[PDB]
């Protein structure tokens, strides 16, 4: 509790590849962990401009910033200063697949995020490789303990510029690097938006708001 201050900064590094296009992203961010709110600024340092929709990347840049009821153990906050690790698979309806592995630690007072990501089997004419997405709709992640870790499931929806939508099934596993109290099953409501971006999305600012509730 005393190690996660009410205002926290973080740095993030991502190495990735989508349908063969390789890239690196460096970012800084900040937020109020106990309010469940955060913002980040991200810069494509290698491989820019990206030939794919930024949206598939935005959910990969921070579950330390989730507002939790007092009766729900904040497992991921408790994992610090050691931190936690998480791995994710997003299976999109058109066959596209994104895999992510991530490490979160605490160093010199800030959170350090190391991310690796791979996207594959995205149709060439699909909305991802053609940049036809308008960001994510608000999501509810079903969290539950299992295998000694905290798992999360979500059915997520990307807005399509034609007024339609692009569906994805997301499963994530978060595990503290030290023994900490796991919660019971609950839900986390998440809103993620791109708040600013330059013309070619080589600099992008994001906002996320996350809140835990009972079910």
């Amino acid at each position: 509790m005393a190690i996660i201050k009410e205002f926290m900064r973080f740095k993030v590094h991502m190495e990735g590849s989508v349908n063969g296009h390789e890239f690196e992203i460096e970012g800084e961010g900040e937020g109020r962990p106990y309010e469940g709110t955060q913002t980040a600024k991200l810069k494509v340092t290698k491989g820019g401009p990206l030939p794919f929709a930024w949206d598939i990347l935005s959910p990969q840049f921070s579950k330390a910033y989730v507002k939790h009821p007092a009766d729900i153990p904040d497992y991921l906050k408790l994992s610090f200063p050691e931190g936690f690790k998480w791995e994710r698979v997003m299976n999109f309806e058109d066959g596209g697949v994104v895999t992510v592995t991530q490490d979160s630690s605490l160093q010199d007072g800030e959170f350090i995020y190391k991310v690796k990501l791979r996207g594959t089997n995205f149709p060439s004419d699909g909305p991802v490789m053609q940049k036809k997405t308008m960001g994510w709709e608000a999501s509810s992640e079903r969290m539950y303990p299992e295998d000694g870790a905290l798992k999360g499931e979500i059915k997520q929806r990307l807005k399509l510029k034609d007024g339609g939508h692009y569906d994805a099934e997301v499963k994530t596993t978060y595990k503290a690097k030290k023994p900490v109290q796991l919660p019971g099953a609950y839900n986390v409501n998440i809103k993620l938006d791109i708040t600013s971006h330059n013309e070619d999305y080589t600099i992008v600012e994001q906002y996320e708001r996350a809140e835990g509730r009972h079910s």
């Epitope: 791995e87 994710r88 698979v89 592995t101 870790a149 994530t172 596993t173 595990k175």
Partner: nanobody
Framework: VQLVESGGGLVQAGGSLRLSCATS????????MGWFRQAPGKEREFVAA????????DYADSVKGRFTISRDNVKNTVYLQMNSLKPEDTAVYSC???????????????????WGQGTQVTVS
């Protein structure tokens, strides 16, 4: 430190097997695991690998679509479901734990350690 493969056997092509590997001596759920196979006279080759969470899997091209790697992080066991078996799948199959606790699509034999004794798979 201790990996024991089981489930091998002899079947005709088109059949199925399910290899398992029981683990002991380390926090299984923190390590990626890999299946390799070694044919007579040849060197070990990569078959499949699975990250610590089980969400990220990787397969050699020659088995993709036919084989499925999985894991049970409660029982601490690795599995390789083998369907549509072909004669060229005949080999000794061995399981290994990744040396580094940060696997990411690493297929090299040198990226894995603590090898079990293996189990024989023969396909006619």
């Amino acid at each position: 430190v201790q990996l024991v493969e089981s489930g091998g056997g002899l079947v005709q092509a088109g059949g199925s097997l399910r290899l398992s590997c029981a683990t002991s001596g380390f926090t299984f759920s923190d390590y990626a695991m890999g299946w390799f196979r070694q044919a007579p006279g040849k060197e070990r080759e990569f078959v499949a690998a699975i990250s610590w969470s089980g969400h990220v899997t990787d397969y050699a091209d020659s088995v993709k679509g036919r084989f499925t790697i999985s894991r049970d992080n409660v029982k601490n066991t690795v599995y390789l479901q083998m369907n549509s078996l072909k004669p060229e799948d005949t080999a000794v199959y061995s399981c290994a734990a990744a040396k580094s606790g940060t696997w990411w699509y690493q297929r090299s034999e040198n990226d894995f350690g603590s090898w079990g004794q293996g189990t024989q798979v023969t396909v006619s």
